Amino acid sequence: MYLEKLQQWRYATADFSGAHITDDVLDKLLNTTRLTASSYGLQPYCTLVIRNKGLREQLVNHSFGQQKVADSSALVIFAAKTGAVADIVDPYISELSQQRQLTNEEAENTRNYFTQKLQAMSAATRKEWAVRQAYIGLGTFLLAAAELEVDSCPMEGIEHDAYDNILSLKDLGLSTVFACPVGYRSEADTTQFQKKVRQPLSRFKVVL
Amino acid sequence: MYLEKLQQWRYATADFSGAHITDDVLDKLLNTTRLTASSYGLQPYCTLVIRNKGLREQLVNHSFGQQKVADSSALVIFAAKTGAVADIVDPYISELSQQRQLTNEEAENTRNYFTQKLQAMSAATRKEWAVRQAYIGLGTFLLAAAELEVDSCPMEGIEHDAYDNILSLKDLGLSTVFACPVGYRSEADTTQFQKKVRQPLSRFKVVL
Numbered sequence: 001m002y003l004e005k006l007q008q009w010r011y012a013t014a015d016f017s018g019a020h021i022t023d024d025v026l027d028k029l030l031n032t033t034r035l036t037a038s039s040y041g042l043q044p045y046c047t048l049v050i051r052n053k054g055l056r057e058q059l060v061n062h063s064f065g066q067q068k069v070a071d072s073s074a075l076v077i078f079a080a081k082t083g084a085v086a087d088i089v090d091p092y093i094s095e096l097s098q099q100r101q102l103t104n105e106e107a108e109n110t111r112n113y114f115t116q117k118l119q120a121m122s123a124a125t126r127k128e129w130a131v132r133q134a135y136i137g138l139g140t141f142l143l144a145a146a147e148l149e150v151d152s153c154p155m156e157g158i159e160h161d162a163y164d165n166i167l168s169l170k171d172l173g174l175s176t177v178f179a180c181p182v183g184y185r186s187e188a189d190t191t192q193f194q195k196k197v198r199q200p201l202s203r204f205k206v207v208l
Numbered sequence: 209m210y211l212e213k214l215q216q217w218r219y220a221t222a223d224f225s226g227a228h229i230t231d232d233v234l235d236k237l238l239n240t241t242r243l244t245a246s247s248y249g250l251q252p253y254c255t256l257v258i259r260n261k262g263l264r265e266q267l268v269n270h271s272f273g274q275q276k277v278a279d280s281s282a283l284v285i286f287a288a289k290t291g292a293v294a295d296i297v298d299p300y301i302s303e304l305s306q307q308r309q310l311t312n313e314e315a316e317n318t319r320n321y322f323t324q325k326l327q328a329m330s331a332a333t334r335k336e337w338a339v340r341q342a343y344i345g346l347g348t349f350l351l352a353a354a355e356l357e358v359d360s361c362p363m364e365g366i367e368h369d370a371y372d373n374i375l376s377l378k379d380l381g382l383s384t385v386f387a388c389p390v391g392y393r394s395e396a397d398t399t400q401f402q403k404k405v406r407q408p409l410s411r412f413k414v415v416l
């Protein structure tokens with residue numbers, strides 16, 4: 001399978017070159033990510049793009065000294081929607097309305113249905129629900145990056161609240177879930193030649 | 209991009225046909241899914257495969273009557289490792305040691321590194337950590353299914369504790385995360401013809 005070949009090409013890049021990543025490439029990567037399935041189709045997360053070097057150097061200090069946060073072409077941050085329920089529901093209803101040519105009443109009934117269902121969860125449960133959806137997105141993103149021969153590294157090893165504070169995400173109703181520097185591996189990154197370690201299928205598949 | 213085409217081909221299948229999915233196809237799907245990146249490469253989850261029709265009709269009764277759980281050719285359940293820390297760490301070290309040819313000393317030091325790390329998490333925290341990894345694997349699985357032109361539907365609308373009871377998962381140190389019937393859509397599924405709804409790139413991508 002092609003996706004198996006993509007799985008073998010990618011790796012958790014340790015050292016990036018100084019090569020630039022174009023906006024066209026990053027847009028292709030995030031456009032493919034955008035089409036990922038989500039719970040109820042609500043897509044309760046987004047992808048932030050940061051290139052500014054100064055800002056990213058600040059994030060290194062809140063990424064346990066992991067320099068690749070800044071020393072890469074760009075940084076993508078996946079952020080969950082953790083603010084007003086309306087910021088999750090309304091943008092979906094607008095798209096649903098337009099795409100499915102719904103009547104005003106039908107749109108309002110769907111808006112109500114999802115608003116009530118999300119309000120039924122606690123803030124904590126809703127946040128983790130959103131976080132989970134973003135992890136599905138990461139799965140897409142890692143393969144989309146491989147198709148484009150774009151290197152990356154997913155990073156949970158960051159100070160989440162510090163990222164949120166530094167980037168003022170609170171006024172956007174967002175919460176950092178994980179970060180992914182993107183770019184092109186350094187010639188000098190010897191970790192690209194380590195053999196991949198994965199569960200064999202005899203352990204990963206359990207027939208009941 | 210090819211992965212864009214896969215995204216457009218797939219959908220959350222509402223009505224499955226009774227057509228057989230072969231083991232060779234299901235194995236290609238799970239083999240691609242098994243190569244998914246995970247936090248520390250520890251892959252703290254697995255996929256359970258169930259075909260038994262009556263067992264699944266029972267799971268239907270704990271899935272708010274979503275008959276697709278039984279109607280499909282097979283059911284794949286993503287299950288997080290929620291038992292002994294050793295059952296996450298040891299299988300990793302075994303594969304790591306074999307693939308990268310570690311000395312006994314290095315393998316033990318690395319085992320000890322991971323056991324310490326996982327034990328520092330509360331049981332709840334470690335469980336949700338593992339759950340998050342499984343959601344990355346779902347992202348891969350949805351695209352792998354698309355590449356094989358296998359239909360699927362991810363499913364969180366299940367009674368999770370009932371699934372674990374019914375399937376005896378506590379004894380295996382596993383917790384149901386979500387379920388995914390797999391097979392081939394029925395021509396009678398009218399939802400396959402509906403326009404796919406996703407929020408536009410202008411909202412999904414926020415450039416800081």
Ligand SMILES: Cc1cc2nc3c(=O)[nH]c(=O)nc-3n(C[C@H](O)[C@H](O)[C@H](O)COP(=O)(O)O)c2cc1C
Nearest residue numbers: 010011012154155156157158196245246247248249
């Ligand atoms: C959710 C997630 C978080 C990760 N966090 C970090 C991180 O903070 N820093 C880092 O260098 N690698 C991080 N990794 C990279 C993993 O260590 C790597 O994916 C795993 O060992 C599998 O190897 P491969 O991706 O190179 O094929 C993370 C990976 C995932 C999936």
Ligand SMILES: Cc1cc2nc3c(=O)[nH]c(=O)nc-3n(C[C@H](O)[C@H](O)[C@H](O)COP(=O)(O)O)c2cc1C
Nearest residue numbers: 037038039040041218219220361362363364365404
């Ligand atoms: C994590 C997750 C859980 C889902 N749970 C269910 C479910 O329990 N039952 C169902 O019919 N669809 C379920 N869906 C399907 C979504 O409703 C569907 O993915 C979404 O509306 C986007 O449309 P598409 O997948 O057809 O492109 C789930 C999807 C995801 C990603």
